[model samples]
Target: MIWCHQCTGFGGCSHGSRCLRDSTHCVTTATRVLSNTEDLPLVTKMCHIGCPDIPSLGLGPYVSIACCQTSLCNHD
Candidate 1:
């Protein structure tokens, strides 16, 4: 598994549907890279549990999500 430097190193990051659309935060380590459709549900679930209010991007059959830093949790 790849080392998630964002979550593993920096704790976590704020997430939003459009957060990565215009920024580099989406590609961070906290954003785990899933390999197959089977993993999508699990990944999304984790993201939801971590940051439930964060918006998700649904492109075709792919979903992208982000995590929030401890300080930013519940702020948005």
Candidate 2:
């Protein structure tokens, strides 16, 4: 089985979406946003079939996301 890190780490991460249909790639993500001027970093490391390096569009200018195909690449 393709070993990928589950979404259980520092910051606000959850164990949701752990199945990769193709098992072709691992996935990682990092996101931060401001709430009441507080820095909230939401990072998640997990597995996915395939994904983009970054979002094609931003829900907000302060939002951030990242994706990788390498085996368990999400280090943050």
Candidate 3:
């Protein structure tokens, strides 16, 4: 099993915890809105089977995602 950092909202890796799943990639997702500023990252981290496909067109930078392969690499 592999470990990935998990949490929601801002706060870097603080208060985040390691979770395990049968996968090779760790995923981090973040969304930014008006009231919820981009500085305040409403993020979610976990082990992903595979990264999702990027949309052809949409809010663009308002939302973003990243995936990595190192232990607890999702802690961003």
Indicate which candidate wins on TM-score. Answer: 3
* Candidate 3 lDDT by residue in tens digits, 6-36: 6654644433354555566777776643453
Give the range where candidate 3 is weakest over 10 consecutive residues by summed lDDT: 53-62
CA-lDDT, candidates in order? 0.30, 0.55, 0.59
Give the alpha carbon lDDT tens digit for every residue of 1-76 in model 1.
1112223222243333323222222232223333344332323322222333323322334434454443223222
**Stretches > 4 Å off in candidate 1:** 1-49, 53-60, 71-76
Assess candidate 2 and give its TM-score to the true structure.
0.51
RMSD of 1: 11.3
Rank by TM-score (best first): 3, 2, 1
Which residue pairs overlap in candidate 1's backbone?
A: 13-67, 13-68
Badly placed stretches (over 4 Å) of model 3 are 13-20, 33-39, 53-61
Lowest summed lDDT window (length 10), candidate 1: 1-10
Cα error, candidate 1, residue 64 (Å): 1.0
Instruction: Residues 1-76, candidate 2: write the lDDT tens digits.
Output: 2556677445755454445666656666555533445355655566656764543322355545555666555554
Q: For model 1, what is the alpha-carbon lDDT of residue 1?
A: 16
**Top lDDT hit:** 3
